[PDB]
């Protein structure tokens, strides 16, 4: 029975282990969408400065 429990624990840990991996594997992917989007906004800010320096159009 000891064996049993120990084995289960190991498997359970592996379960949690994989449950952990996928989790972060998701979070970075989502983060990958965020950062790119952030970059887009950064570009906009830069351009918002450009139009802000064109006095006649501004």
């Amino acid at each position: 029975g000891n064996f049993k429990s120990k084995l289960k624990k190991a498997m359970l840990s592996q379960q949690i282990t994989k449950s952990t991996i996928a989790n972060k594997m998701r979070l970075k992917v989502l983060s990958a969408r965020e950062q790119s989007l952030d970059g887009i906004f950064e570009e906009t800010k830069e351009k918002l400065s450009g139009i802000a320096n064109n006095r006649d159009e501004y």
């Binding site: 064996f3 084995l7 190991a10």
Partner: peptide
């Protein structure tokens, strides 16, 4: 009468020592 061996039959110790060694397969996995 060899009834003393009846007690000596209690070990028989390696019968479970080998079992524990095999159960070490869980630690190996």
């Amino acid at each position: 009468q060899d009834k003393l061996k009846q007690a000596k039959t209690d070990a028989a110790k390696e019968i479970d020592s080998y079992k524990i060694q095999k159960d070490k397969e869980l630690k190996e996995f």
